[PDB]
Design a protein around this motif. Structure first.
Motif, PDB file in Angstrom:
ATOM      1  N   UNK A 173      35.850  41.621  36.004  1.00 50.11           N
ATOM      2  CA  UNK A 173      36.741  42.683  35.560  1.00 50.11           C
ATOM      3  C   UNK A 173      38.148  42.077  35.591  1.00 50.11           C
ATOM      4  N   UNK A 174      38.429  41.304  36.639  1.00 51.06           N
ATOM      5  CA  UNK A 174      39.728  40.649  36.799  1.00 51.06           C
ATOM      6  C   UNK A 174      39.964  39.636  35.694  1.00 51.06           C
ATOM      7  N   UNK A 175      38.926  38.884  35.346  1.00 51.87           N
ATOM      8  CA  UNK A 175      39.052  37.883  34.299  1.00 51.87           C
ATOM      9  C   UNK A 175      39.208  38.537  32.930  1.00 51.87           C
TER      10      UNK A 175
ATOM     11  N   UNK B 208      50.541  43.902  31.932  1.00 53.14           N
ATOM     12  CA  UNK B 208      49.648  44.748  32.718  1.00 53.14           C
ATOM     13  C   UNK B 208      48.393  45.141  31.943  1.00 53.14           C
ATOM     14  N   UNK B 209      47.243  45.070  32.610  1.00 54.68           N
ATOM     15  CA  UNK B 209      45.973  45.428  31.982  1.00 54.68           C
ATOM     16  C   UNK B 209      45.018  46.086  32.974  1.00 54.68           C
ATOM     17  N   UNK B 210      44.331  47.126  32.504  1.00 56.88           N
ATOM     18  CA  UNK B 210      43.376  47.890  33.301  1.00 56.88           C
ATOM     19  C   UNK B 210      42.069  48.117  32.529  1.00 56.88           C
ATOM     20  N   UNK B 211      41.002  47.463  32.985  1.00 58.57           N
ATOM     21  CA  UNK B 211      39.687  47.577  32.357  1.00 58.57           C
ATOM     22  C   UNK B 211      39.022  48.895  32.768  1.00 58.57           C
TER      23      UNK B 211
ATOM     24  N   UNK C 222      35.775  50.037  34.891  1.00 58.50           N
ATOM     25  CA  UNK C 222      34.723  49.264  34.238  1.00 58.50           C
ATOM     26  C   UNK C 222      33.861  48.536  35.279  1.00 58.50           C
ATOM     27  N   UNK C 223      32.598  48.295  34.949  1.00 63.58           N
ATOM     28  CA  UNK C 223      31.701  47.590  35.862  1.00 63.58           C
ATOM     29  C   UNK C 223      31.828  46.080  35.649  1.00 63.58           C
ATOM     30  N   UNK C 224      31.338  45.308  36.614  1.00 61.86           N
ATOM     31  CA  UNK C 224      31.419  43.857  36.511  1.00 61.86           C
ATOM     32  C   UNK C 224      30.551  43.311  35.377  1.00 61.86           C
ATOM     33  N   UNK C 225      29.385  43.916  35.154  1.00 58.84           N
ATOM     34  CA  UNK C 225      28.514  43.451  34.078  1.00 58.84           C
ATOM     35  C   UNK C 225      29.182  43.617  32.715  1.00 58.84           C
ATOM     36  N   UNK C 226      29.850  44.749  32.502  1.00 57.25           N
ATOM     37  CA  UNK C 226      30.517  44.956  31.220  1.00 57.25           C
ATOM     38  C   UNK C 226      31.808  44.138  31.144  1.00 57.25           C
ATOM     39  N   UNK C 227      32.370  43.814  32.307  1.00 54.50           N
ATOM     40  CA  UNK C 227      33.580  43.015  32.336  1.00 54.50           C
ATOM     41  C   UNK C 227      33.221  41.605  31.897  1.00 54.50           C
ATOM     42  N   UNK C 228      32.007  41.181  32.238  1.00 52.18           N
ATOM     43  CA  UNK C 228      31.534  39.851  31.874  1.00 52.18           C
ATOM     44  C   UNK C 228      31.416  39.767  30.360  1.00 52.18           C
TER      45      UNK C 228
ATOM     46  N   UNK D 280      34.528  49.980  45.132  1.00 53.35           N
ATOM     47  CA  UNK D 280      35.568  50.240  44.138  1.00 53.35           C
ATOM     48  C   UNK D 280      35.218  49.701  42.745  1.00 53.35           C
ATOM     49  N   UNK D 281      34.503  48.582  42.701  1.00 52.97           N
ATOM     50  CA  UNK D 281      34.044  47.993  41.441  1.00 52.97           C
ATOM     51  C   UNK D 281      32.621  47.521  41.717  1.00 52.97           C
ATOM     52  N   UNK D 282      31.681  47.942  40.875  1.00 52.44           N
ATOM     53  CA  UNK D 282      30.281  47.572  41.053  1.00 52.44           C
ATOM     54  C   UNK D 282      29.752  46.681  39.947  1.00 52.44           C
TER      55      UNK D 282
END
Lengths: 374, 368
Positions: free
Chosen positions: A23-25, A38-41, A219-225, B168-170
């Motif tokens: 999500x950070x990436x 600034x960005x927010x997923x 957002x979730x980590x899987x979708x962030x990927x 907080x993030x999953x």
């Protein structure tokens, strides 16, 4: 694409890695590309718009300007806050018309708190004018760039002109493979306030303490990927979209009108569109304000036939967006028309624009279209 | 674990979103299921389809997670919070009392099944029926829990399930709305995708949301449902191990007779006895309230953290939250007592009996 690779990494290192790695990436990739600080997923672009409106101070009964020629997902957030939408017809770019905008702000008995500007089909709106108008009137500019990620206006990325910008990543089908939206903005505090809201408004405590209420929009980590994977090929995709657009123009330019992008602007042409039997002299047929009531719009005979024929050839084409000022849901809301968006619906056609298409694919489609209109 | 397999299939090309809904129907026996972005979204749509409007009153569990009640705020309805009984859930008498004293008739009740424990369903279902109150079950943490062999979430007009905890993030995300009325559920589905009329072009009679789950997360949801039962059984084992090693100093309140708590999270109370239950009966106009943790609980959390072992306090009741200042709440003192003497323990299914024992040892040493 690295979608699979990245998703595998998420699952494999979840037990040991830092929180929200992808999500950070994803956010950093968008900042690097758009140059926003600034960005927010988030879960979606609609959610991004919702938070933007809220951190901007929009309250029940406040007035929010919006594009009429757009997708309802761009304006529904106005309804969530029980604010009042004021719709504005478009110009030759498919976006909010400068004249109508000025007229609306002037005739508004109550000054609008913000404007949600849509960059329709990736096309940039007349930003210098709109930005100035919003500044001079103390109106918060919120760019709905859901389909304009990759689009630029004078070397500046759409979405970075207003106080807030919103990008989407997976088209408008009723169900998609992935999902997600990105909220960007100028004010770090406001963006971080939205981040705070996107996770149920939790105070920094050992237990759950709440001074306000929030949402589940993070957002979730899987979708962030997947988002990172998509950002890695964004530019290449935009170039391919424009190649596809130029091919359509090459094979259909004789009978269809392909409205140019603003000079010194770069439309991502995320979806190729064209107008049949059109002449610029048809624009701005009127200039009237109304109170919305539902209305159907008849497709030009060649367009409805075109959609039907290509359908029997297994090619999917669609009409352009149906303006909000003609929708029953907005019955009673104020709208300013010049007749442009209804004319575009009437003579417009949305063409297949998948980047996996080859020049031949675009050519076979163009031949079938020519065969249908004659 | 078919996650990657299913996701890979998704890419090679809403099949899995449909399958995910089917798996929940097969598991819970509900006739209608709708896959969404979150449980909060599910609750939001349930309240709306239920007819909740601005200023309507919605009853809700006080001992819960705010994600469960925020939807009331979204619609600008007024919340009325109710304290809990020995199951961690809404107390039957406080519920009736709140109903008896309401200026006007509450439109609905959002009932949370805390930590997976079943609430007293026969009584609550009856109370809602007799008063024409729409029952919405917040079974976010209760998927896999049953009451008299009937799946929690299928007692109310609407039920809600969640899938990925509250970090907080999953890794993944998702919620599921189930219900008894096909028409109501299909209206929610209609709302979850921007309220589109079934036309070639875009036509709207109403406004909706973007709450629909993606195919990727749907695939993960299917994988999770296929191993849900195996997970539940392990959670229950873990719970019993904690009771076996800590039962002497901690109380592990029994699940209702003939019910089955999925024990998704193992919780326990220190220096507690059933005799301190229902000690403070009253109703208030909500004001923020700080509750000091029992000395041993705060210390327990600190000691385990030093050992890189995460534990947390139990939920801090809504009637003590600043955001709900002014709202009404009927209390008996239980949720606050549980907060001061409670502890949420590590409950990963990958834990072996030895792991739970070792964790228990550190705990016993902490409280000495």
């Amino acid at each position: 694409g690295n979608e699979l690779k990245y998703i595998e990494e998420v699952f494999k290192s979840n037990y040991i890695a830092p929180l929200g790695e992808f999500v950070n990436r994803f956010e950093q990739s968008v900042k690097d590309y758009s140059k926003s600080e600034n960005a927010l997923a988030l879960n979606s672009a609609t959610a991004a718009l919702h938070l933007a409106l809220r951190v901007a101070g929009v309250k029940q009964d406040d007035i929010v300007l919006a594009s009429s020629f757009t997708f309802i997902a761009s304006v529904a957030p106005i309804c969530y806050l029980k604010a009042k939408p004021v719709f504005i017809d478009c110009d030759e770019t498919y976006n909010i018309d400068v004249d109508l905008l000025k007229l609306a702000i002037k005739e508004c008995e109550k000054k609008p708190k913000a404007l949600i500007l849509t960059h329709l089909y990736g096309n940039a709106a007349k930003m210098d004018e709109i930005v100035e108008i919003c500044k001079e009137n103390d109106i918060v500019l919120i760019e709905d760039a859901a389909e304009a990620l990759g689009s630029f206006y004078k070397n500046k990325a759409l979405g970075t002109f207003g106080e807030f910008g919103v990008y989407s990543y997976n088209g408008n089908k009723i169900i998609t493979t992935s999902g997600g939206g990105m909220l960007i903005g100028k004010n770090k505090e406001k963006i971080e306030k939205a981040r705070f809201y996107s996770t149920q408004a939790r105070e920094n405590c050992l237990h759950y303490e709440h001074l306000d209420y929030g949402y589940n929009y993070r957002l979730s980590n899987v979708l962030g990927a997947i988002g990172v994977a998509q950002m890695e090929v964004l530019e290449q995709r935009v170039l391919k979209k424009r190649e596809i657009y130029e091919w359509y123009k090459e094979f259909l330019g004789e009978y269809f009108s392909f409205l140019d992008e603003l000079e010194n602007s770069r439309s991502n042409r995320w979806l190729s569109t064209a107008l049949i039997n059109f002449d610029k002299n048809e624009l701005n047929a009127c200039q009237k304000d109304i109170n919305i009531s539902q209305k159907n719009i008849t497709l030009h005979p060649k367009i409805s036939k075109l959609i039907e024929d290509l359908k029997n050839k297994q090619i999917e084409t669609r009409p352009l967006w149906k303006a909000m000022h003609t929708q029953e849901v907005f019955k009673g809301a104020k709208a300013y028309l010049n007749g442009n968006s209804e004319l575009f619906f009437q003579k417009g056609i949305c063409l297949p624009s998948g980047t996996a298409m080859s020049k031949d694919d675009v050519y076979e489609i163009s031949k079938l279209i020519l065969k249908s209109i004659k």
